[PDB]
A paper describes a structure:
A specific SEN biosynthetic pathway was identified in Variovorax paradoxus DSM 30034, which is recognized as a way to incorporate Se into organic matter in bacteria. The bacterial SEN biosynthesis gene cluster encodes three proteins, SenA, SenB, and SenC. SenB catalyzes the generation of the key intermediate selenoglucose product using SeP synthesized by selenophosphate synthetase (named SelD or SenC)15. In contrast to other types of GTs, SenB performs dual functions in two-step catalytic reactions, catalyzing the formation of C–Se glycosidic bonds and the subsequent cleavage of Se-P bonds to generate the final product.
We selected two SenB-like enzymes, CbSenB (GenBank: RYF17368.1; 65.5% sequence similarity), which was derived from Comamonadaceae bacterium, and RsSenB (GenBank: MBC7468551.1, 65.2% sequence similarity), which was derived from Ramlibacter sp., for further functional characterization. Like SenB, CbSenB and RsSenB are located in the SEN biosynthesis-related gene cluster. Catalytic activity analysis revealed that CbSenB and RsSenB recognize sugar donors like SenB and utilize UDP-Glc, UDP-GlcNAc, UDP-Gal, and UDP-GalNAc to generate the corresponding selenosugars. The catalytic activities of these three enzymes for UDP-Glc, UDP-GlcNAc, and UDP-Gal were similar, but RsSenB utilized UDP-GalNAc more strongly than SenB and CbSenB did. Mutagenesis assays confirmed that the residues equivalent to N20/T23/E231 of SenB are critical for acceptance of various sugar donors in CbSenB and RsSenB. Unlike that of SenB, the asymmetric unit of the crystal contains two RsSenB molecules. The monomer structure of RsSenB is very similar to that of SenB, with an RMSD of 0.99 Å for Cα atoms. The spatial positions of the putative catalytic residue K158 in RsSenB strongly overlapped with the structures of SenB. In addition, the mutagenesis results for the catalytic residues in CbSenB and RsSenB were consistent with those for SenB. These results not only provided two other SeGTs but also further demonstrated the universal effects of the key amino acids N20/T23/E231 on the promiscuity of sugar donors and the putative catalytic residue K158 on the Se glycosylation of SenB.
Residue numbers in the entry: 2 to 11, 20 to 287, 292 to 329
Write the structure that this text describes.
Amino acid sequence: SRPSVAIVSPNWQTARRWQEFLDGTCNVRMTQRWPDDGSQDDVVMLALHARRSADSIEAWASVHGDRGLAVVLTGTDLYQDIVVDPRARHSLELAGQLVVLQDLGAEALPPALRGKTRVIYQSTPSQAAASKPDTVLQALMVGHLREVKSPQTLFQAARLLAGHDDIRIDHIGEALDPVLGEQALATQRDCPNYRWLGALPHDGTRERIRCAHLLVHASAMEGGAHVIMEAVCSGTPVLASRIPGNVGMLGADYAGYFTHGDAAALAALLVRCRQGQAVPADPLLARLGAQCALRAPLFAPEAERAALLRLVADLM
């Protein structure tokens, strides 16, 4: 009496968020491998992480072709796995529909794959803006220490700013690359205003996003950073590396980009934002705030719910 939908994945994460969106009208179940026990009636498969879920994508195609099959793509899929893992790339060719997370994710793809790609922004409930002090600027960057996140840009910005005792930098992220972890420790040793907080639970990170004056996201590539959505929907504006995955989140006209790898430009934007605290002496910080507020409707849960049900309907 209800269509059976399988979500293949290895409350805020996509598999659970999408299961809750779909739970009203479909029989949804998350599963790690598709041909499982309750598979006999499935009409739709929504597969996350093509590389780890390729066997389940290929199992589906052997039974259905691309009928009812969609694959969701992140930055790891777009710029690493589909140019390196031939089974991962072939999952994209098996898919009926491909999903990217912001309106530039499709330009990373060849024309034959682009023509079956649609955009579905992630969503999160909005959070009321926190009160924040005007005697210091507190910046925050979030992401496990891997080279693709470019934490070395933030390390160098902290050093350039060591003469600015009214600017602070907090840094959340597990030290998955121990060399980058040592550099976090060295930066903290040499720059008292820089703090590496290590691996934090999701709820603590979400609250520190809300409490910071700004989020810095410096990555070399992105499929659509979850933490930029969280910041935008919490009243915390962003300083972002000017890469397609960030522009898709924040907009071609956004005033808060810096050239990727350019630690001097990041530091200078930090000094400018400090100068926005109070009639503010520098208008940039307020401008970033107003622009992010205009981006926030893109991440409303109701928009993603509606887009997901449209996808499932298209696939039935």
